[PDB]
Design a protein around this ligand. Structure first.
Ligand code: CA
Ligand code: ZN
Ligand code: ZN
Length: 271
């Protein structure tokens, strides 16, 4: 798998930051900052050769969208998917939650194209809307896939809040093979890992799932600061769901590591 360049990930974050600033300060469902986020991501993927689909739905009286991107090629009967919700709460720009996950998945999708990668499993990436309203977008996606298509999913990897300013390195403990893949990646860097989001709808229907997370409103412990650095007794993300979840609410090292891990997993699991 290629190394994902942190600068590129950060450049998407800067774009999302400006979009929020230009649309009232947030990128929430039913507000213009959301649609403007989808437009940016879609434009980057279309230029890269992906086939993109906008799936629209209505929730709480307003229209939301999911953006689905398929990389032409691969076994149609074995699809590996990776996703991240693209909406924020309305208090702010949602840079760490979840511009971090969204930009990492986007840069991994562009890396696929730049590398001319031809995986064995078909690759599909998704950016979910209205996660903050109760996983509405990912639930809509899953509820609307026919049984036959669902049984084609080989796995779903979720990235939600992967750049927390006082980070932990947590791996989802669901499918063991996915889980191991990520653990192994961290082991090679010599970073220890320890064991509410879009993966739920898929897990509920039997699709193997996994993912990475750097921590939210819980307090980092002494032992955790010992293993990862940062500040014990402070939340992993002091600006969770706050107006302060802006560009300076990102820890570059965590973001870079998690982005590279995502690419390593997607390469690894798609072959
Ligand atoms: Ca990197
Ligand atoms: Zn989130
Ligand atoms: Zn959230």
């Amino acid at each position: 798998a290629p190394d994902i360049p942190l600068a590129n990930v950060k450049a998407h974050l800067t774009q999302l930051s400006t979009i929020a600033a230009n649309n009232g300060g947030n990128r929430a469902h039913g507000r213009p900052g959301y649609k403007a986020s989808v437009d940016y991501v879609k434009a980057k993927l279309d230029a890269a050769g992906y086939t993109t689909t906008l799936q629209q739905f209505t929730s709480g009286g307003a229209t939301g969208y999911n953006l689905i991107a398929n990389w032409p090629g691969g076994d149609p009967n074995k699809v590996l998917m990776a996703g991240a919700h693209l909406d924020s709460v309305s208090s702010g720009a949602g840079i760490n939650d979840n511009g971090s996950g969204s930009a990492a998945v986007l840069e991994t999708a562009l890396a696929v194209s730049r590398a001319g990668y031809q995986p064995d499993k078909h690759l599909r990436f998704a950016w979910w809307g209205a996660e903050e309203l109760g996983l509405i977008g990912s639930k809509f996606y899953v509820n609307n896939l026919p049984s036959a298509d669902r049984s084609k999913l080989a796995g779903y990897l979720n990235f939600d809040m992967i750049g927390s300013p006082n980070p932990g390195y947590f791996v989802y403990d669901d499918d063991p093979v996915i889980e191991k893949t990520f653990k192994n990646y961290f082991a090679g860097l010599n970073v220890p890992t320890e064991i509410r989001s879009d993966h739920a709808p898929f897990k509920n229907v039997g699709v193997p799932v996994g993912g990475l997370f750097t921590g939210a409103g819980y307090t980092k412990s002494a032992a955790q600061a010992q293993k990862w650095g940062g500040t014990a007794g402070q939340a992993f993300d002091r600006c969770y769901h706050s107006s302060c979840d802006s560009l300076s609410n990102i820890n570059d090292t965590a973001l870079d590591r998690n982005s590279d891990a995502a690419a390593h997993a997607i390469w690894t699991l798609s072959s």
